[PDB]
Design a binder for this molecule. Structure first.
Ligand SMILES: [Zn+2]
Ligand SMILES: [Zn+2]
Lengths: 93, 97
């Protein structure tokens, strides 16, 4: 059979790389339970406004999160499924 | 909530393994069929020692498991979490905008 194309692999690689950051993953653990404002997230991570709004505004262009203060959510059902499966599998321990 | 720092770090380490093109190419194959290192190496066009070396961290972080059949060792996606992780990340990559 065929492996996915090298270009497809490299992009999929780049997408997992952004997930390979514990601070990002902390934000996403919050968005996993509900949509939340720019300041509700900062108050959970116990940091600032102008800095949650740096990381989120990063994750937006990465396609992990979306926004409508602003409200953030997990972009869509792939993101939700991906975060949960990863975190349940790690939990099996 | 927010997951604990320790838990976030372990999860970041799981995802770091997935952040390599070659390992993801291996996973794309195991997604359809349990395969040997020999089957894997033929399909990708690399040495076998090259596969085995890539498979190590896939084993250690439990992305893949293996069975023995006589002298053959056959690898699979560890479980349904791995199938979903993979498929969902590929579909989100190839979708919509
Ligand atoms: Zn699992
Ligand atoms: Zn998607």
């Amino acid at each position: 059979l065929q492996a996915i194309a090298p270009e497809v692999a490299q992009s999929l690689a780049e997408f997992f790389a952004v997930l390979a950051d514990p601070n990002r993953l902390r934000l996403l653990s919050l968005l996993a339970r509900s949509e939340l404002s720019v300041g509700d997230l900062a108050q959970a991570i116990g940091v600032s406004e102008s800095a949650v709004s740096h990381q989120l505004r990063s994750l937006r262009n990465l396609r992990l999160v979306s926004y409508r203060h602003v409200y953030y959510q997990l972009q869509d059902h792939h993101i939700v499924a991906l975060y949960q499966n990863a975190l349940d599998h790690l939990q099996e321990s």
